[PDB]
Amino acid sequence: GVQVETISPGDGRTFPKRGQTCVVHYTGMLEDGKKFDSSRDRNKPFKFMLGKQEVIRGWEEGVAQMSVGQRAKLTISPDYAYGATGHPGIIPPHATLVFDVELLKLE
Amino acid sequence: GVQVETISPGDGRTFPKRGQTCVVHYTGMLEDGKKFDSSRDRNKPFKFMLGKQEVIRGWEEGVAQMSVGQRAKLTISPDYAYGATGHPGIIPPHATLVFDVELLKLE
Numbered sequence: 371g372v373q374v375e376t377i378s379p380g381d382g383r384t385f386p387k388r389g390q391t392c393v394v395h396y397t398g399m400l401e402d403g404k405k406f407d408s409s410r411d412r413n414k415p416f417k418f419m420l421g422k423q424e425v426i427r428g429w430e431e432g433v434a435q436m437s438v439g440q441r442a443k444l445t446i447s448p449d450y451a452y453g454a455t456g457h458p459g460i461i462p463p464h465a466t467l468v469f470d471v472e473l474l475k476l477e
Numbered sequence: 478g479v480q481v482e483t484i485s486p487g488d489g490r491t492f493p494k495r496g497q498t499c500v501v502h503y504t505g506m507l508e509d510g511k512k513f514d515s516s517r518d519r520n521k522p523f524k525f526m527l528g529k530q531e532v533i534r535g536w537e538e539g540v541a542q543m544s545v546g547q548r549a550k551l552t553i554s555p556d557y558a559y560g561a562t563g564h565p566g567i568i569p570p571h572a573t574l575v576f577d578v579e580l581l582k583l584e
């Protein structure tokens with residue numbers, strides 16, 4: 371599944387609704403902290419919508435539990451990410467993924 | 478994991494080696510038989526290589542157990558396919574997949 375550990379608190383009131391656009395900053399790492407990607411590096415937030423198979427399930431369920439402005443570490447089991455296959459040339463089979471995500475705004 | 482059920486026997490001697498190119502025909506279906514894709518429809522075999530994260534794990538492990546000319550039904554658990562996420566607008570979360578695959582040749 372997904373585990374959400376808070377780094378910095380959100381507003382405690384504005385949670386993402388299916389059909390809203392979430393704007394985030396994220397860093398993706400293996401369990402040992404090795405970084406594989408970050409929107410922070412690109413200087414451009416990542417935007418996505420809930421309820422449209424636009425992201426791995428771990429995110430769909432993890433982000434939904436965050437409130438605007440919150441910064442959290444999402445730990446995602448392989449079945450809620452890339453499972454036994456992984457993601458070609460970046461993530462190996464059966465990898466639990468760690469993402470540092472900041473929920474910037476909802477639009 | 479993956480279960481391989483033979484429809485028609487292969488040569489019983491020529492099994493795919495990592496690094497060889499497999500040429501197949503396949504039909505992908507949900508567990509109720511509903512078809513989502515087929516190379517047969519396109520009149521063009523699908524080619525892929527073992528050991529390069531080019532296909533879902535269920536295929537990587539299923540095809541490796543087939544010999545040239547064999548026709549088999551591969552039943553693949555969600556973690557060996559698209560897991561809890563599915564594949565946008567085609568396969569739902571937590572779906573076991575059925576593929577009718579024919580191993581035409583190795584190159």
Ligand SMILES: C=CC[C@@H]1/C=C(\C)C[C@H](C)C[C@H](OC)[C@H]2O[C@@](O)(C(=O)C(=O)N3CCCC[C@H]3C(=O)O[C@H](/C(C)=C/[C@@H]3CC[C@@H](O)[C@H](OC)C3)[C@H](C)[C@@H](O)CC1=O)[C@H](C)C[C@@H]2OC
Binds near residue numbers: 406425451565
């Ligand atoms: C149209 C094609 C290009 C389109 C690419 C972009 C919009 C740019 C966007 C910044 C992607 C990043 O590109 C720099 C890059 O992000 C990773 O590095 C990453 O950190 C990651 O894991 N993310 C990204 C942040 C959200 C969670 C997760 C994800 O859900 O990503 C999604 C993902 C891969 C889902 C698959 C979809 C197929 C399902 O079958 C499978 O289910 C198992 C899960 C991405 C957002 C896709 O929806 C959309 C795309 O692919 C991946 C390791 C590889 C991925 O590049 C491809």
Ligand SMILES: C=CC[C@@H]1/C=C(\C)C[C@H](C)C[C@H](OC)[C@H]2O[C@@](O)(C(=O)C(=O)N3CCCC[C@H]3C(=O)O[C@H](/C(C)=C/[C@@H]3CC[C@@H](O)[C@H](OC)C3)[C@H](C)[C@@H](O)CC1=O)[C@H](C)C[C@@H]2OC
Binds near residue numbers: 453503514564
């Ligand atoms: C470069 C991009 C386009 C490139 C597309 C083609 C060469 C055309 C090729 C006929 C794909 C089909 O296009 C008509 C279509 O085949 C499906 O219909 C299907 O029957 C399927 O499941 N197949 C296809 C036959 C092999 C097994 C499986 C697969 O392994 O497919 C692979 C797959 C999706 C793997 C993901 C990869 C990311 C991992 O993170 C994830 O791990 C969870 C698993 C395909 C072969 C990818 O390697 C390469 C591509 O995507 C998918 C339901 C959706 C897929 O279209 C995208």
